[PDB]
Amino acid sequence: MKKILIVSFLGKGRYYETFYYSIEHSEKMVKKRLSPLANAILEKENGNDVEIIFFVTNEVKNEFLYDENNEYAKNILNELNEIKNYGIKVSYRDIPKGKNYEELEIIMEEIEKLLLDFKGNKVIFDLTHGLRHMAIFTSSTVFYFKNLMEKANKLEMKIVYGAYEIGEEIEKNLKKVPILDITQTLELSDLTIALEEFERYGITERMIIVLKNIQKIVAKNKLCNLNELKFSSLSRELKLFEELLKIPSPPEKIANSIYKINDILESSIREFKLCSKNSENLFFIKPIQKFLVDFQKIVLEKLPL
Amino acid sequence: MKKILIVSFLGKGRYYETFYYSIEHSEKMVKKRLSPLANAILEKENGNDVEIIFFVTNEVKNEFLYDENNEYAKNILNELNEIKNYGIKVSYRDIPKGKNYEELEIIMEEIEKLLLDFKGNKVIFDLTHGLRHMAIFTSSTVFYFKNLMEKANKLEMKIVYGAYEIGEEIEKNLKKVPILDITQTLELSDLTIALEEFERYGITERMIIVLKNIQKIVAKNKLCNLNELKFSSLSRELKLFEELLKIPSPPEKIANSIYKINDILESSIREFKLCSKNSENLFFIKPIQKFLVDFQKIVLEKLPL
């Protein structure tokens, strides 16, 4: 149902045909040179509209893509030409090499332009192609962009890439390659900040938002029983506890709120510790576990004396 | 004066001799095969105690590093072996290749262990060598770790790498390669979090920490007059203001504090705006300017009706 904009860099390179797949669904494989095209195909199977934007320097365009005697260039130019056949709008943006902070700032400004101009729901940064330099830098700025725009605009940003360096080998230069999604790891700091705010000030807003995102992540693991995780009841109780803080409230009501929150959390912690051990997880468990355990210690430390 | 750990990955590669330089000090060039080694020498000449740790997979260790019949590996081991003659310790940590979320989680656990066990002041992540997959992923987790170690340790963290992909080729396979420091791009989120907290809650502690870090970043430009930013006076005004919010205070004193803070910010903005030129090799101008302007907007929006 959504729209997705896929942003990718494009450098000089071989671009071997590759069996891309999402690590969550290893059954669905797409044979393409460009991870952005494979991802676009996968999202379109999910019922979404997909657009691709490529950042390319004038140097890669003139010196590489248009060299008739470079077969890697001819293959990639052909694939780039055939994306329109899949109903994917494609466009290109020129950027500098990024040799210093001024050029890197220029690149940041161009990305911000994309995010402001895009009127859909979801932006995927595909870091498979282009220089190591671009990938590292972009990966390091995406959380900044997400903080600016997820709030200003209604955009879900994700960072993904085909990890061909660790891919399974079928044939010559033909590899089964998982597209890894590392969005969760960009956002992990939110767990810490939320606990920080709840402990120091009793502020509950970030905790509730975090619990929502944690629910979405943990539902990926279908052996986890959300009726024992109860993240919805936790959020409700947390909001009520904050309301109790906002008004002068009798100590017993705050303690009773804390004991309810603790009671929910212990069964939540037990369920998460169990279910995440009993099935391969397709997310990072350790920070979610740490979040709930610290949440519990913090909440019990709020008890009136 | 500072105890420094340099953390880097290590893959199979040819490891050509390279002229590395800090983009800030292009006169100072170090001829080495490993970016971590050049960075370590630069820190040692600045008077710091330096240690280097390489994350390596068992396969790279056995097939490349410890192969007597691989000359490139022997070049690398030799360079590492007498860095020891300057009091620079070198060691290795085993990690898996990171083919799924569980292996990536182990890699984060190992990084976290290194950072907690480290008994220095500063850790530099050098993302030049090793797999692109590791460089992207580590880049995406570094803010989570920095967030942990600021609270647990107050540990200074740096993210750097040699951009060999955009270096000058003086002779075949001999390159002048800039070491880019992109730590600032990770900490831009600190500006965003501080602003969010102040706007939503009137909470100022993160703003004060952010102002101190901005002053430090700007100190790189020695033509900037740090007194003219007036950041200590800004910080006291902020503490008075949060204090004013805490108890029910007379609206005029609130307005007095706000207009005082706004005037101070006017002076900081002028100083940064006129001084930040000729800093294309020193820092990002735009997000810092935007932080001060937004700070102004938010503080004025708290004016009583």
Side-chain angles (χ1 to χ4, degrees), chain A residues 217-251:
Chain A
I217 294 173
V218 162
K220 277 178 184 43
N221 183 331
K222 326 90 163 179
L223 285 311
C224 288
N225 168 38
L226 281 46
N227 171 76
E228 290 302 305
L229 296 169
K230 276 187 212 314
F231 291 138
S232 265
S233 358
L234 273 174
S235 290
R236 247 206 294 295
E237 260 329 304
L238 265 184
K239 182 147 190 52
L240 293 188
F241 176 78
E242 203 201 57
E243 325 211 280
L244 300 170
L245 288 173
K246 282 155 156 345
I247 72 199
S249 255

Side-chain angles (χ1 to χ4, degrees), chain B residues 53-67 69:
Chain B
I53 294 175
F54 284 112
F55 280 118
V56 297
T57 64
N58 199 44
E59 294 75 34
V60 166
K61 219 159 110 140
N62 290 334
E63 302 159 352
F64 168 73
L65 208 49
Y66 289 129
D67 179 24
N69 306 307

